[PDB]
Design a protein around this ligand. Structure first.
Ligand SMILES: Nc1nc2ncccc2[nH]1
Length: 158
């Protein structure tokens, strides 16, 4: 039948030449895993404006240019609504990251990406982000640990 309906999300990675900023999710779904900063796009908001707002809310950072780098769709067994995640990168930030109720920011060297404490799908697409390639992905999860199906492709546009 028809693809499930999807909810629009953003995800921002501050990626510098030798390190990347992640945040430890402190509560709710995905707590205990390092992730980029993001959340649901609000009514009337552009995707990029939502990305900037979520970055500021969760990490305290404001940034200049955000670059579109990929799109990931997540599906969970037992939930009909999908997550449509628009992924952005930036390399130039203004200020110091600050812990929020949602996220504890932390820098990681690029030879110390904490995959064991990240979502399982990151093993597949996060390397593409690091290579500066654009991608579309889809992952179907049983619970929080098990991937039942996934697709991933590199693209020139997205
Ligand atoms: N990397 C990543 N973030 C996620 N958020 C929610 C569900 C699955 C996820 N995979």
């Amino acid at each position: 039948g028809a693809m499930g309906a999807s909810r629009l999300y953003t995800l921002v990675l501050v990626l510098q030449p030798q390190r990347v900023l992640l945040g430890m999710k402190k509560r709710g779904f995905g707590a205990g895993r390092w992730a980029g900063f993001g959340g649901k796009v609000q009514e009337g908001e552009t995707i990029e404006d939502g990305a900037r707002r979520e970055l500021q809310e969760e990490s305290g950072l404001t940034v200049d240019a955000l670059h579109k780098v990929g799109q990931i769709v997540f599906e969970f067994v037992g939930e009909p609504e999908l997550m449509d995640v628009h992924v952005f990168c930036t390399d130039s930030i203004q200020g110091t990251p600050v812990e929020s109720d949602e996220m504890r920011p932390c820098w990681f060297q690029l030879d110390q990406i904490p995959f064991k404490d990240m979502w399982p799908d990151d093993s597949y697409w996060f390397p593409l982000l690091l290579q500066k390639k654009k991608f579309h992905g889809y992952f179907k999860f049983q619970g929080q640990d098990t991937i039942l199906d996934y697709t991933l492709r590199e693209v020139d546009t997205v």
